[model samples]
Target chain A: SYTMCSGKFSIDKEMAETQHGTTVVKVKYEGAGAPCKVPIEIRDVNKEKVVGRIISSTPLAENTNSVTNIELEPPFGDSYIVIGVGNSALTLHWFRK
Target chain B: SYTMCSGKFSIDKEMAETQHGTTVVKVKYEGAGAPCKVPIEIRDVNKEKVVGRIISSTPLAENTNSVTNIELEPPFGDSYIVIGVGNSALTLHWFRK
Candidate 1:
């Protein structure tokens, strides 16, 4: 079961480019503070590589320090993932089945 | 001739509503004051329904009445569209061309 949407509404694909089959790591800024360290793991589930990661902090404001996209390759045709990490919150924007 | 991305990064797909064999219309918030009325028109182009909408206002702050997503149905497998309507600024996020 997948519910992910399509398009570029905010950021780019580079911010979420930690690939599947392992826990990929990256860094992000959460705004008005020190930069954070994060861990992103992409796993193959139900024939789709689902992105699972931990954000050290959400951006203080919109456009402050934000991560907005995740990309999977090879067998990606059904859906995608975009997590809007806000101040102390995580909002997922998605589509598909 | 097409450049777009996928996923729900910020908001849902119901905000940019209105169908078009012609000019479709909808309403959005630029923020702060009145809920400005907007227009959205979906056109069948190159075998895809592209969302064309005009926002009367752009949302304010982080979560202050903002619009974040757009959806195209049926023969949609290539890409998607997300328009981050900001205060006096608009950013387009996309992938897969």
Candidate 2:
């Protein structure tokens, strides 16, 4: 288990593999991801089922950058895979190190 | 006022210059607009203020694309300007032709 980590993301480049455990996740789009609000999902070493998920209210058809925070209950067995979703190639960042 | 016009849009190129009048406008994003729910606004010849607006609940961070429609009451004098908002360049289509 740990506290923080962050990185970039995109549609084709989904999944931010966090080699740690967390009950939370977040995504950001600030520059020009306008008029689109996206939902994010969470998965773990299971590689199949989702663990938890969340989404943000800002940066949709609004801004390219928005800081979002989500929760994953019960935690995962091993690590985390922050799956990036949607189109327009998101410049994303998630979780902790 | 008119009833239909459609074209492409980007954050840098927001206005779908409609040389005609309208009481309705719409936008679409289909393959990858995931998780982002954006707001849409309408403006006319003023170019200084808004005229009307609306948005959709689909294709947010969940898909790169969605179809949205909005209304502008009272209509305009000669033409309309559909202002596209938010980040990540949007591949859009509006009304009247």
Candidate 3:
């Protein structure tokens, strides 16, 4: 469980163990001010190598408040979700069970 | 366990039970085209009444590919995530354990 807030936006992230050895991530972004259009990526924590290629970049429009859910399969290893907007970036850690 | 693809985009949704009486949702959005800027809402499958107030709308930009994760806390009841874009919409259902 991890919670952090920056600028006009705040994010709440959590990871849960699923049926297999994989894990699911829940990210809640809340704020106001034109929707944050940023690049999101997942990477291995230790080596800092990019793990998953972001295939979804749903723009946060209007009020800039929404929740996004993503599931990771197979290659269940320690990783982090990195969200970068301009010079600010948020990195949250997750470990598969 | 459910998966589906529509238009030029594919979405993989998964739900998992966690420590509390809560659930985590994982949604993978992959496609090409100016990123889908849609309105997403969660509702009760039976009555179809809106359940959660979307507080985050992170715009999907450029490649229009990414994974979004969201977690539901307490008040865990049967519900569905409704994503609407123009005339197309995707609804996913999840049950609490």
TM-score for each of the candidates: 0.19, 0.29, 0.34
Q: Could you give candidate 1's per-residue lDDT for residues B4-62 as a string of tens digits?
A: 11111233333332363111112233443222211122223332436422233322222
Q: Model 1, which residues run further than 4 Å from truth?
A: A1-20, A30-97, B1-82, B85-97
What is the per-residue lDDT of model 2 for residues B6-55, given as tens digits with 9 covering 90 to 100? 12233422334344443444545432233443323333444432432332
Q: Tell me what TM-score chain B of candidate 3 gets against the true chain B.
A: 0.53
Q: Model 3 over residues B1-97: C-alpha lDDT tens digits?
A: 0111222323555666677566565555554333443334567746344644343433233334666655654234677765532223456667654
Candidate 1 docking DockQ:
0.05
Q: Chain A alone, model 2, TM-score?
A: 0.41
lDDT of 3 by residue, A1-97 (tens): 0111222323555666677655556555543333443334566745443634443434332334666555554245677765532123456577655
- Superposition error at B74 for model 3 (Å): 7.7
The Cα RMSD in angstroms, rounded to one decimal, for candidate 2 relative to the true structure is 13.6
List of chain B TM-scores, one per candidate: 0.25, 0.37, 0.53
Tell me the deviation in Å of residue B82 in model 1.
Answer: 7.3
Model 3: DockQ vs. true structure: 0.02
Candidate 2: deviation at residue B6, Å? 22
